[PDB]
């Protein structure tokens, strides 16, 4: 078709890690603690 897709070899374990960062934690700074406009946290 019109697409090339390169998937990292451990993509399934990486997706599980996104969830386990919250559900089973073991450090990224949340956007709410960075310098951003007030609108960033308020949906239109």
């Amino acid at each position: 078709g019109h697409q090339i897709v390169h998937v990292r070899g451990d993509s399934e374990t990486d997706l599980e890690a996104l969830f386990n960062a919250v559900l089973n934690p073991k450090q990224t700074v949340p956007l709410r603690l960075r310098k951003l406009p007030d609108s960033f946290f308020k949906p239109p």
């Binding site: 897709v5 998937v7 993509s11 996104l18 700074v29 960033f40 949906p43 239109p44």
Partner: protein
């Protein structure tokens, strides 16, 4: 608008389609088509090796860089995809690279390209029904299986997408869009804010 003097995004629609007998349904996750954000505030949420967001921003043009904060609508499949449309005043071969990132690192890269069609004295490009990767489909399904929107937003804190649109012949950056998401409230559709990325 997500545009420079020479190139512009006309539409970006991420969706799922379902057909069951004589009933068709299309659900929109995201639909595009300004305030500023200091790009130093988002560098660690994207790959920062050669060809990373910082590298791309330094090379320029700096006016081609945007940050989109989107509230994706998960209140709802046969097909998950994205349809986008662009315009240019120059006849380029458009190359669109979409980098799905978790913890600021690439986990999926999608590369697509489109040749131009001259319409009303402008060059139009349309990426029609680009299939979503399995990582994105499973991510949407797993986020939807969480009982509460607050857990979905917490999981999304470590997820970003970067799109880099280039002219094939010169490899110049025509447009670059960073995406950050939250999930839309139950009684709301998808909404977003668009920000220009600058240095303060």
């Amino acid at each position: 608008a997500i545009a420079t003097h020479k190139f512009r995004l006309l539409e970006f629609t991420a969706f799922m389609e379902i057909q069951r007998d004589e009933i068709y349904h299309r659900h929109l996750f995201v639909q595009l088509g300004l305030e500023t954000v200091d790009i130093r505030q988002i560098f660690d949420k994207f790959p920062e090796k050669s060809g990373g967001l910082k590298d791309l921003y330094e090379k320029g043009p700096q006016n081609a860089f945007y940050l989109v904060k989107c509230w994706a609508d998960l209140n709802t499949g046969d097909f998950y995809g994205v349809t986008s449309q662009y315009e240019s005043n120059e006849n380029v071969v458009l190359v669109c690279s979409t980098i799905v990132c978790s913890f600021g690192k690439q986990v999926v890269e999608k590369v697509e390209s489109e040749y131009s069609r001259l319409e009303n004295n402008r060059y139009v490009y349309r990426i029609q029904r680009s299939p979503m990767c399995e990582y994105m489909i499973n991510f949407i399904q797993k986020l939807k299986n969480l009982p509460e929107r607050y857990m979905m937003n917490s999981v999304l804190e470590n997820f970003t997408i970067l799109q880099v649109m280039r002219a094939r012949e010169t490899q110049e950056t025509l447009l670059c869009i960073a995406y950050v998401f939250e999930v839309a409230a139950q009684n709301s559709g998808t909404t977003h804010h668009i920000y220009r990325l600058i240095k303060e």
